[PDB]
Design a protein around this ligand. Structure first.
Ligand SMILES: O=c1c2ncn([C@@H]3O[C@@H]4COP(=O)(O)O[C@H]4[C@H]3O)c2[nH]c2nc(-c3ccccc3)cn12
Length: 127
């Protein structure tokens, strides 16, 4: 293997191919693979979060309640989410819901803050 599979996947993602491979190797060491089915909430707006997600398989819907939640966007393989709760306050600012069989590569806060949080795509993200 999985470490090699994770290496090969991360090297294919434009945000992460900017990273030194030794950093990619450390990420591949520590990331956890989680799996979702259609309709399964991955993140719930208003929860407190410490994890960053990279989609390695499937698609997800992002929604946010600003009564009912409005559809924001769909993300797929190679996209990522969960950074805002890692950028200051730890509140989740939107829901992310699986729309099918999903594999996310999940990075914890300690790994994120050292290895990912400085990436300009991530730190300068805007919606
Ligand atoms: O358009 C988006 C969006 N598209 C994807 N995502 C991802 O959903 C994740 C949910 O967890 P998180 O830890 O908050 O990180 C998030 C992002 O990665 C989005 N978030 C997101 N927040 C806003 C917002 C916030 C505060 C005030 C007004 C609008 C708009 N907005």
């Amino acid at each position: 293997i999985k470490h090699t599979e994770y290496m090969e996947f991360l090297k294919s993602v434009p945000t992460f191919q900017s990273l030194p491979e030794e950093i990619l190797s450390k990420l591949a060491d520590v990331l956890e693979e989680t799996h979702y089915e259609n309709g399964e909430y991955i993140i719930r707006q208003g929860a407190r979060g410490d994890t960053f997600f990279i989609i390695s398989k499937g698609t997800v819907n992002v929604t946010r309640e600003d009564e009912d939640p409005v559809f924001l966007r769909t993300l797929g393989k190679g996209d990522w989410f969960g950074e805002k709760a890692l950028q200051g306050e730890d509140v989740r600012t939107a829901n992310v819901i699986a729309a099918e069989a999903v594999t996310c590569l999940v990075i914890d806060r300690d790994s994120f803050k050292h290895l990912i949080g400085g990436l300009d795509d991530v730190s300068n993200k805007a919606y």
